[PDB]
């Protein structure tokens, strides 16, 4: 059993995904995607809500899988507040960079996921005491996916950056 934040985010993504099946992707994208038009810049939810949208069953499964594994591990070891903050920083910044790369029509939790992969691995290397670590077997496949990248390429790399950064900052204190 994984903590409340790990579960809340899995239920958010499932609720949204189900809505995308009923209403169709575009209808949901219209309301949850990153602002496509500056006029919309004050619709604050969009800097986060892009993360909740998935486009195929494999897309959701693969993301929630990693998120359960890694998110739950952060929540278990470092608390619910830590995972909230990793989520919010990484969703917002991976979104920001993904938009710049390729515009606003993107979604998926893998920005947050690559940030979690980055955080868990660095934090496990420089602070083995935290009780979190990523197997090199996983940091390998993680790297294999990256280079394989319709992927949100800016999200993957921005998320990863964010997760390394935060892990370093937290590994110093």
């Amino acid at each position: 059993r994984a903590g409340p934040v790990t579960w809340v985010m899995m239920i958010a993504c499932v609720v949204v995904f189900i809505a995308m099946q009923i209403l169709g992707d575009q209808e949901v994208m219209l309301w949850l995607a990153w602002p496509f038009d500056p006029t919309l810049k004050f619709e604050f939810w969009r800097y986060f809500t892009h993360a909740l949208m998935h486009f195929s069953l494999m897309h959701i499964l693969f993301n929630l899988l990693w998120w359960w594994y890694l998110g739950g591990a952060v929540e278990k070891r470092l608390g619910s507040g830590k995972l909230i903050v990793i989520t919010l920083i990484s969703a917002l910044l991976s979104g920001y960079v993904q938009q710049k790369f390729s515009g606003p029509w993107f979604g998926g939790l893998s920005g947050v996921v690559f940030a979690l992969m980055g955080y868990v691995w660095l934090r496990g290397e420089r602070d083995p005491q935290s009780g979190i670590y990523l197997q090199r077997g996983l940091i390998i496949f993680a790297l294999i996916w990256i280079v394989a990248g319709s992927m949100a390429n800016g999200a993957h790399i921005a998320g990863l950056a964010v997760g390394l950064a935060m892990a370093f900052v937290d590994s110093l204190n």
């Binding site: 195929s56 993904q98 029509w105 998926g108 939790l109 990248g149 992927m151 949100a152 999200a155 993957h156």
Partner: peptide, 5 residues
């Protein structure tokens, strides 16, 4: 549309 992956 791009899948963040």
């Amino acid at each position: 549309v791009r899948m963040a992956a």
